[PDB]
Design a protein around this ligand. Structure first.
Ligand SMILES: OC[C@H]1O[C@@H](S[C@@H]2O[C@H](CO)[C@H](O)[C@H](O)[C@H]2O)[C@H](O)[C@@H](O)[C@H]1O
Ligand SMILES: OC[C@H]1O[C@@H](S[C@@H]2O[C@H](CO)[C@H](O)[C@H](O)[C@H]2O)[C@H](O)[C@@H](O)[C@H]1O
Lengths: 391, 391
């Protein structure tokens, strides 16, 4: 598309998710393998990342709307992202081993800021441009997936050689990413209107949909990779093919997000979320009837259909219900602060189901919670209906 | 020259001094004008950087030699330089004003680690390559002067537009540093053996050569720019002229160090330090008898004549006389550390001299101490003398 901002931010995503692609997928490996962390102390790291994300995420909602279309906040995010290289290497890496992990655990608030709490803020910002310009959020964020793809592809291949090469590659993306932010050309509320949203029922109705459907789905994605390798005689060959799927599968997200933002506009965007929660729910429940390798793989791919219909359709439902001047705040509260607060308790009772009643015996329960609240939310979520599509 | 490592480390200097030159000479301007900081609480920053530099430079001397050609410590340096842009922009800048200086002066210890106690670590390291690869240390180091010039030229130009741009551009060079480092192929003792150095008479002689001439010369450049601007019809316009000298003077300084090692090698280096000290000495006295503005411009440039004969001669003297197995240590212990330790002591009475008598009235006492020790060092520093030059 001729619009310049499209081609600017389209690349901003590509890089920001590239630099996150060397962080999120391979973290448990980077722990248990590279830095040698006991799986009984690995949870300690995540205990902080999902804690400092409870203060940063609500707080960014405020700045995202009090600043509006001002780049000011992104400068600090993209700034810290430059420290990405020496973080993992010289700081974060030996700080877990050398002194108390705690010194690194609360020293690992950085990556909460930049990624866990940064990424949602980045998308929340970029949606605002999409309404000021012509293009849709979907084809913009499309690149973020293929950006995310490339990193995971360049890790595994440079892993046997010099795995560190990727981290420096990341901090270089931060600069080229900050370059874009400069060439980007663009162009309020009071806190009393925050408390009013807690009064609004239709705020709670969405938090239900997230807690029930998305928080339950995120705890599910945790030990799915280990579960995946269990359908192979050799635990290695599963770990391999697991990597092969995640790579190609993002080219699908780019393929799905191609026409995704056009499909939602007819369907409404409430019914987009229903459709997401459904795909989530089918995938998870299908893990309970899957016995073979050929079966379990298809399921990992169901995630690639689901994501486009969630995050695109999310903002559609947001802006098509609440004022656009609050579109950023509630996205970093409902789909984050609350999703995080619930994932605390659901990642716990998950572990107490796996080791208790087993994998599939738990994936059934969670699968029912997914579906349960997916279907609850056909009556709960304010907007059109699935029945309105049928008409 | 077909020498591989020469061009690598030659450029390596170019970029590392591009990133220093864009901070060190502009530092006080970056304080008083940009951050709007007073003139009395300037000497809380420089009275902390120096403190931590005193306790790093020793620590750096030993671990520079325990590594030898192992690139380890030089990696930590280049790694932490990647955090350069986030530092001055979003950390060192805003944080200092936010909380008590003390709380944010400790933030300025990083600034010691990478430049004050970092640059000399980069010199010692490459000096050790100067013999394993066939090239002279001086002809590589001249790249630092042109690099130092290029940034500083970019500094003043960009200050009118966006003074931030130089910092970001710096953290870009920290990456290409890592690159050049990877294409460098380069392949013991104990601290008990280091202690013995201090009981060597030969060590005291060079140690005194520093405290006397070198320390007295590095304090001379403190408020010299204040003394320089008075020789103009305008201070503001006389600042622009100082910018031409500081830049072009380095272009000359390269050319001087182009031929330096070729000369220093046959003279011995012992007589090059007496020479360097005489170049310094001639420059100090000139300020006390500065009856014109054209004079003080040449004196500014007389510094550029001195630089090579020192840096080239420090190693060419250390390596010649002292054993190579302590080359980096004694360079960081005798020159950097002791000078710094001694400079903190000379900077006090200096202020109690300017306000006791004046600028031109104080410089005479320094020049006596300067040349005094320059001539004393003729009968202490073991080696040849200016006496052998005539033969
Ligand atoms: O911190 C989690 C964030 O996850 C992303 S979604 C993420 O997108 C990549 C490619 O960009 C892949 O599809 C992953 O499978 C998918 O999880 C959200 O956009 C953020 O809001 C956070 O939820
Ligand atoms: O922190 C001060 C450091 O200064 C350099 S010397 C520096 O070199 C540049 C070009 O590389 C210019 O000539 C400047 O005039 C000159 O001061 C030292 O080599 C380091 O050890 C530090 O002392």
């Amino acid at each position: 598309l001729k619009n310049t901002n499209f081609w600017m931010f389209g690349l901003f995503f590509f890089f920001y998710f590239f630099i996150m692609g060397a962080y999120f997928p391979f973290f448990p490996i980077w722990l248990h393998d590279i830095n040698h962390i006991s799986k009984s102390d690995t949870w300690i790291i995540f205990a902080a990342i999902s804690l400092f994300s409870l203060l940063f995420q609500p707080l960014f909602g405020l700045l995202s709307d009090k600043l509006g279309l001002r780049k000011y906040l992104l400068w600090i995010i993209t700034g810290m992202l430059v420290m990405f290289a020496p973080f993992f290497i010289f700081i974060f890496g030996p700080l877990l081993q050398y002194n108390i992990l705690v010194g690194s655990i609360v020293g690992g608030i950085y990556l909460g800021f930049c990624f866990n709490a940064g990424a949602p803020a980045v998308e929340a910002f970029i949606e605002k441009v999409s309404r000021r310009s012509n293009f849709e959020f979907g084809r913009a964020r499309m690149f973020g997936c293929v950006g995310w793809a490339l990193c995971a592809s360049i890790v595994g291949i440079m892993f046997t050689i010099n795995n560190q090469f990727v981290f420096w590659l990341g901090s270089g993306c931060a600069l080229i990413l900050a370059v874009l932010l400069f060439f980007a050309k663009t162009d309020a509320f009071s806190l009393k209107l925050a408390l009013e949203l807690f009064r609004q029922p239709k705020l709670w109705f969405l938090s239900l949909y997230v807690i029930g459907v998305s928080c339950t789905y995120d705890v599910f994605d945790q030990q799915f990779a280990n579960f995946f390798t269990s359908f192979f005689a050799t635990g290695e060959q599963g770990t391999r093919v697991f990597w092969y799927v995640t790579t190609m599968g993002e080219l699908l997200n780019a393929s799905i997000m191609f026409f995704a933002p056009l499909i939602i506009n007819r369907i409404g965007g409430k019914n987009a979320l229903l459709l997401a929660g459904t795909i989530m729910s089918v995938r998870i429940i299908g893990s309970s009837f899957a016995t073979s390798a050929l079966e379990v793989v298809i399921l990992k791919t169901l995630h690639m259909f689901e994501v486009p219909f969630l995050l695109v359709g999310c903002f559609k439902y947001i802006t098509s219900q609440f004022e656009v001047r609050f579109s950023a705040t509630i996205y970093l509260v409902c789909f984050c602060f609350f999703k995080q607060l619930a994932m605390i308790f659901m990642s716990v009772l998950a572990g107490n189901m796996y080791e208790s009643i087993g994998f599939q015996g738990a994936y059934l329960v969670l699968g029912l919670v997914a579906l349960g609240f997916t279907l609850i939310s056909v009556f709960t979520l304010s907007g059109p209906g699935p029945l309105s599509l049928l008409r």
